[PDB]
Subunit: 355 residues, 2 copies
């Protein structure tokens, strides 16, 4: 079982080093191999996704990814910027199914901007389509406007599009997730205005015929933004497109109060996945030894459960995280009154000790 | 001896009920205004066979600003689509070139428990979202369903829409938002997805070009995902936010929910000269139409926006806004915002309380 470890930039190495520490403390023998990605990829060989790094990711059974991006690299030309690595891995490896848990941990309820009764016990799952939508749709660019009242003027444009098989495959994923949970699926679109969205909804309804045991509901993205804020525990699984899922997953993450706890998984048709913290880069603390590693460690638990058929090992990691939280360990971002405040490495050590 | 002229378009159902109270508050002020009424919506249909009678449009064009109630009712829902009351909203925006949708997010401390947020995050909120209303993916061509013309799924059934914004479209919404920021705390946040969308990078570049005419306003940028997070975390961090049609729809709705009383919220649609149509954000309520219980506060607050943003009359706007704050302090509530121990009143008695607090 081969894992490609792609730590990235800034806090990425710091946090991934702790996930690797946790993986190495398990009974099982993994083949871990590291490769540069993001700014580190540019520094090593002039591209955020070096050919050799992509090749390693393709060969592996799963990918454990840190975070990319730093101030140092913001000046590079757009195509060589660190963030292009994430997009390239998703595209080249056909990782179309993104899973974003939003969980509020009992020790950390007060961190939420919501009144505590709205978030205590929150555990919902957003499924985000990751390979299509307006984020990739052609054509796109800047042009002279070809028509309308502003014909001839400079105009920026992108094309939103979704084909039948693209909606079908992410629908099935989302229904399968709902079957294993509370058997409730909400599909989010903007079908009262967008043709792409009505098409999405039609396909979702067609797929729903195959899952008579799952209650399908639909909601417009504007109303979903409202309803996540009002009462996020009304939902269980939510499925939506690339763009709307980017916005809603991030909203849901913030409503938990602690984005440093939340992992992300991006999977292909065979459940090979890239597993990463959901939170992204943190240039203000990068390299200072204080970033929360728990999202990244929990992403390694997801990796074991969903790609490497090691659910018992995933269970052990998740139990160890619960235990360290109950023992009072907190990194700076989740510090609570009277806690044992620790940096990244000492947090990792606490998790290992609780395995 | 020159008076400003306000076109008053009450509409249907609750529309006349709430607008009567905004007119009452305007008339209680010291300065005289020329308030001229005209029918719109179903009332326009009853008078002239169209939801936007020619004479109503002419009055709106002639006037310095427009105060609009709400249109729509069950009795008009059987009309053919083009004559339905709600068409008037679209007609006015199109004909008057009202492209900037002003959507305040305000939270009164007396009503803070209706917010899902911890009260310290939201009590006394007063931020402004300026949403481009006329363009974006919501209207862009081409769009529809087709066989995919290219790509890895070529030949498959595919739905599609086109996001597009031209230079004049972004430039005009930038000017309006920058000018709003000057009438507030001189901070403007532009929201886009410029890391991914070509439309958004273009938007950002035009916003920056415009910003060079407003050196006194601090411009910053934020991605729409991040803004969705930050509105939930700490909405008080903002002053004015400007964004496109679609992102503004989502973010303004999110913000409206975070205030907890979507029913108190005023709205406006402005042109390039800051002439605006001012209306409560809520629209029709056929269930309570004519029953004298609708909350007029959003409409009264819309009349305050009218004075501030269209008529260069910020001190009068402040006086109205202070009066609303006062009646809430005094314990007045309409049925929609009733709190334990309150003085519960209908529309007219709420209007009377605001007049008394001026
Ligand atoms: Mg995001
Ligand atoms: Mg909306």
């Amino acid at each position: 079982m081969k894992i490609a470890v792609l730590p990235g930039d800034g806090i990425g190495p710091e946090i991934v080093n702790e996930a690797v520490k946790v993986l190495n403390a398990l009974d099982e023998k993994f083949e871990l191999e590291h490769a540069p990605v993001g700014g580190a990829g540019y520094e090593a060989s002039g591209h955020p996704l070096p050919d050799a790094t992509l090749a390693l990711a393709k060969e592996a059974d799963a990918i454990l990814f840190g975070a990319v991006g730093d101030w140092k690299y913001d000046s590079l030309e757009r195509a060589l910027r660190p963030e292009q690595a994430i997009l390239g891995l998703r595209k080249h490896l056909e990782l179309f199914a993104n899973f974003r848990p939003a969980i509020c941990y009992p020790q950390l309820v007060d961190a939420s901007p919501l009144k505590p009764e709205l978030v205590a016990g929150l555990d919902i799952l957003i499924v985000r389509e990751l390979n299509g939508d307006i984020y990739f749709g052609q054509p796109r660019g800047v042009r002279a406007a070809p028509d309308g009242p502003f014909a001839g003027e400079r105009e920026g444009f992108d094309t939103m599009r979704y084909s039948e098989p693209e909606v079908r495959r992410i629908a099935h994923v989302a229904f399968q997730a709902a079957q294993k949970r509370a058997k409730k699926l909400l599909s989010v679109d903007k079908s009262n205005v967008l043709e792409t969205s009505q098409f999405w909804r039609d396909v979702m309804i067609d797929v729903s015929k195959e899952y008579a045991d799952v209650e399908l509901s639909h909601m417009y993205v504007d109303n979903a933004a409202m309803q996540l804020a009002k009462a996020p525990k009304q939902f269980d699984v939510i499925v939506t497109g690339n763009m709307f899922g980017d916005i809603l997953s991030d909203e849901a993450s913030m409503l938990t109060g602690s984005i440093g706890m939340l992992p992300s998984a991006s999977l292909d048709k065979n459940n090979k996945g890239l597993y990463e913290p959901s939170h992204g880069s943190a240039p203000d603390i990068a390299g200072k030894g204080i970033a929360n590693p728990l999202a990244t460690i929990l992403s390694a638990a997801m990796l074991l459960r969903y790609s490497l058929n090691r659910a018992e090992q995933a269970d052990r990691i998740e139990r160890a995280v619960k235990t360290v939280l109950e023992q009072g360990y907190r990194t700076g971002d989740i510090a609570t009154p009277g806690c044992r405040q620790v940096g990244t490495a000492a947090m990792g050590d606490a998790v290992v000790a609780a395995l």
